[PDB]
Design an enzyme around this catalytic site. Structure first.
Site, short mmCIF file in Angstrom:
data_model
loop_
_atom_site.label_atom_id
_atom_site.label_comp_id
_atom_site.label_asym_id
_atom_site.label_seq_id
_atom_site.Cartn_x
_atom_site.Cartn_y
_atom_site.Cartn_z
CB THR A 145 -10.56 -7.87 10.11
OG1 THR A 145 -10.08 -6.83 9.27
CG2 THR A 145 -10.67 -9.18 9.31
CG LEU A 146 -14.12 -5.91 14.11
CD1 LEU A 146 -14.98 -6.35 15.28
CD2 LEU A 146 -14.89 -4.92 13.25
N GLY A 147 -9.26 -5.19 13.79
CA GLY A 147 -8.00 -4.94 14.45
C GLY A 147 -7.93 -5.63 15.80
CG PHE B 284 4.57 -3.28 0.22
CD1 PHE B 284 3.69 -2.20 0.13
CD2 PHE B 284 4.76 -3.87 1.46
CE1 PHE B 284 3.03 -1.72 1.27
CE2 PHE B 284 4.09 -3.40 2.58
CZ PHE B 284 3.25 -2.34 2.49
CB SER C 242 -0.37 -8.00 -5.42
OG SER C 242 -0.55 -8.09 -4.00
CG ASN D 287 1.54 -12.04 1.88
OD1 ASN D 287 2.70 -12.38 1.62
ND2 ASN D 287 1.19 -10.77 2.11
CG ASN E 209 -9.91 -2.41 7.40
OD1 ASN E 209 -10.78 -1.59 7.21
ND2 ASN E 209 -8.64 -2.20 7.09
CG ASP F 142 -2.68 -10.57 2.81
OD1 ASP F 142 -3.76 -10.08 2.44
OD2 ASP F 142 -1.55 -10.10 2.45
O1 LIG Z 1 -1.32 -7.62 2.68
C1 LIG Z 1 0.06 -7.23 2.67
C2 LIG Z 1 0.64 -7.32 1.28
O2 LIG Z 1 0.04 -6.29 0.49
C3 LIG Z 1 0.86 -6.09 -0.65
N1 LIG Z 1 0.48 -4.79 -1.18
C4 LIG Z 1 0.73 -3.56 -0.63
N2 LIG Z 1 0.12 -2.62 -1.34
C5 LIG Z 1 -0.57 -3.24 -2.37
C6 LIG Z 1 -1.44 -2.79 -3.43
N3 LIG Z 1 -1.73 -1.40 -3.64
C7 LIG Z 1 -1.13 -0.35 -2.85
C8 LIG Z 1 -1.00 0.95 -3.64
N4 LIG Z 1 -2.27 1.34 -4.25
C9 LIG Z 1 -3.18 2.35 -3.68
C10 LIG Z 1 -4.55 2.35 -4.02
C11 LIG Z 1 -5.39 3.30 -3.48
C12 LIG Z 1 -4.88 4.27 -2.61
C13 LIG Z 1 -3.52 4.27 -2.27
C14 LIG Z 1 -2.67 3.32 -2.81
C15 LIG Z 1 -2.75 0.28 -5.13
C16 LIG Z 1 -2.97 -1.01 -4.32
N5 LIG Z 1 -1.98 -3.68 -4.25
C17 LIG Z 1 -1.76 -4.99 -4.09
N6 LIG Z 1 -0.95 -5.45 -3.14
C18 LIG Z 1 -0.37 -4.59 -2.25
C19 LIG Z 1 2.30 -6.23 -0.13
O3 LIG Z 1 3.12 -6.83 -1.08
C20 LIG Z 1 2.14 -7.05 1.20
O4 LIG Z 1 2.85 -8.30 1.16
#
Ligand SMILES: OC[C@H]1O[C@@H](n2cnc3c(N4CCN(c5ccccc5)CC4)ncnc32)[C@H](O)[C@@H]1O
Ligand SMILES: OC[C@H]1O[C@@H](n2cnc3c(N4CCN(c5ccccc5)CC4)ncnc32)[C@H](O)[C@@H]1O
Ligand code: NA
Ligand code: NA
Lengths: 315, 315
Positions: free
Chosen positions: A214-216, A93, A7, A43, A186, A248
């Site tokens: 990853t484990l936080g 987001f 994304s 990112n 994770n 990321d």
């Molecule tokens: O890693 C941090 C980065 O993640 C970016 N981001 C935050 N959600 C993202 C996302 N989605 C969330 C909503 N959805 C879903 C699916 C299953 C259950 C619930 C919801 C589809 C998948 N898909 C791609 N990038 C995302 C953000 O722009 C940030 O910079």
């Protein structure tokens, strides 16, 4: 040369001074609102570029992307293969983070859905075969099509379905994992992947070259198919500012280490440093690369020998 | 001439196709994202202006307000007394609404905090004494200062604290209510006000001229201090699109009716029409005023006699 798919977004990040615990009609009075460059692929490409790696960003955005493009190009990212929608806006987001780093977020995909129209073959025609393609969270159909294309063209790939794992079926997940050079998740996502795929631990390890989990606050595990396991603790933080994009950052630092010839442990030490730098800032790409501070914090966590080995490939 | 005090905002409104029930790290994949003019005071001023009333908007915004200003001015709203921050941006409301009209929202006040620096005396110097000042959700200190100024200057006022009732103490709420010409709340908020103030129903009614209590799908109650009670049912909707701003719309329609000489029941019938038009659109100011459609839906809900009486005072 790493091709990063996933994304591309704008992140609208807010801070709630309370605890979501204490609070359907939820209303959070927030005391910070900032708009930053985001998306998993943006990112990761940003971080690989800042660290001096060779990287191309491959995903879909809107025409609003010009400034983001300039930002990324200034850090060495090839953005030629970003698909620009004729009509849709870049994904957004929207996230609120509370004092304990809990998060409530909404994600609007926008132009991200058009990533399914991207052909990695065109990228290859332009820049040659990448050494590694990261398959990050994306339009689901694009995630499948990109993985399939990697197999067909003989491109090593990293399965990196973080945020989409809850939305994907077991069969869809199985199709993303087989043959991966790396699987990143994770710990919660790893248990979930096993439950949804119906695969045992051993079933997965027989289909990939390395598992990275990853484990936080507990760090990261690197597990080879023969069971050899490296555990790397975190670089301890001086603040918990915002957890967005920390995973990321870990992945980008780790893979940049690997691209520069470092071993598994050293690469995960570098990834842990980039991760903490992101944890200590609000945006996902708002951290700064300070070579001396990097060497210092790596030495404090992992010893001077490890620190010197790592920064030797970053100068 | 109605002076509307309260928040001025940009609303970023998203739609979640699921149910929040079904889902700390919440993530909602939304299928709509739109940015609209908002804030309680902007919403109420917009509606009063569209309906042909005399209205001035009094609140704090940022320098980004120019286009919003032109929008409101085109509908008859006096925006001369909007305080423009030297540094802060207009407030932002970020909201996700699910298929059952439940909501999860974050509110960033921005320039709203500067409303405490507004003096209604300056408004009066410019346009004379308003017939009614609405004290809508705002910077809390501004809500208190404005109410106090109304009392000192002898300006009739409507206590309309809605979104701030949870954050105000019992004593702060008591100071907003005494001497009000109108008290507006919803039913949940009325119970909350009684609990936090420690006032009984009768204690409140002895301090105000009229209580207006909205009941969601059950309509609205108008209660006089002697107990005389008018109940008005909703104008039945053909869709539930987004509940944001429905209460603001009811208040604006009701108060426009009152300003035009209509009685309590007729005014609440008009308010109910404006409310349903907002329920049927996404933004709070995205509805259109269609005189014939208004007369038709008023007649279908309340009878031709009532409809004709109401539209006689409109255009
Ligand atoms: O890693 C941090 C980065 O993640 C970016 N981001 C935050 N959600 C993202 C996302 N989605 C969330 C909503 N959805 C879903 C699916 C299953 C259950 C619930 C919801 C589809 C998948 N898909 C791609 N990038 C995302 C953000 O722009 C940030 O910079
Ligand atoms: O009526 C719809 C209009 O209300 C506008 N708005 C949405 N929240 C608003 C608000 N807050 C919410 C956050 N906070 C709080 C208080 C108690 C408990 C929890 C949180 C302080 C009060 N204050 C003023 N306007 C608001 C929006 O711009 C929309 O157009
Ligand atoms: Na961060
Ligand atoms: Na609405």
């Amino acid at each position: 040369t790493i091709a990063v798919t996933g994304s591309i977004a704008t992140d609208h990040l807010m801070r709630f001074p309370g605890r979501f615990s204490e609070q359907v009609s939820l209303s959070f009075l927030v005391d910070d609102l900032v708009m930053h460059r985001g998306g998993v692929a943006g990112n990761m490409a940003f971080a690989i570029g800042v660290l001096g790696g060779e990287v191309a960003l491959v995903g879909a955005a809107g025409a609003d992307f010009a400034d983001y493009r300039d930002w990324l190009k200034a850090r060495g990212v090839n953005c030629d293969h970003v698909l620009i929608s004729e009509t849709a806006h870049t994904a957004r987001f929207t996230c609120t983070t509370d004092v304990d780093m809990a998060q409530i977020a909404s994600f609007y995909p926008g132009a991200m859905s058009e990533a399914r129209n991207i052909k990695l073959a065109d990228v290859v025609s332009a820049i040659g075969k990448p050494e590694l393609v990261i398959i990050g969270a994306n339009d689901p159909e694009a995630m499948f099509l990109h993985t399939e294309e990697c197999r067909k063209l003989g491109l090593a790939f990293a399965a990196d379905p973080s945020q989409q794992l809850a939305r994907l079926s077991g069969e869809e997940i199985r199709r993303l994992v087989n043959g991966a050079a790396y699987l990143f998740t994770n710990d919660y996502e790893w248990d979930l992947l096993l439950s949804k795929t119906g695969w045992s631990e051993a079933d997965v390890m027989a289909q990939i070259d390395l598992r990275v989990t990853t484990l936080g606050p507990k760090g990261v595990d690197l597990v080879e198919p023969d069971g050899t396991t490296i555990h790397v603790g975190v670089v301890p933080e001086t603040s918990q500012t915002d957890p967005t994009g920390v995973g990321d950052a870990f992945r980008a630092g780790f893979l940049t280490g690997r691209s520069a010839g470092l071993g598994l442990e050293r690469s995960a030490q570098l990834g842990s440093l980039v991760a903490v730098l992101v944890l200590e800032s609000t945006g996902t790409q708002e951290w700064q690369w300070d070579y001396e501070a990097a060497a210092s914090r790596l030495a404090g966590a992992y010893g001077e020998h490890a620190a010197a080995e790592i920064v030797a490939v970053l100068a």
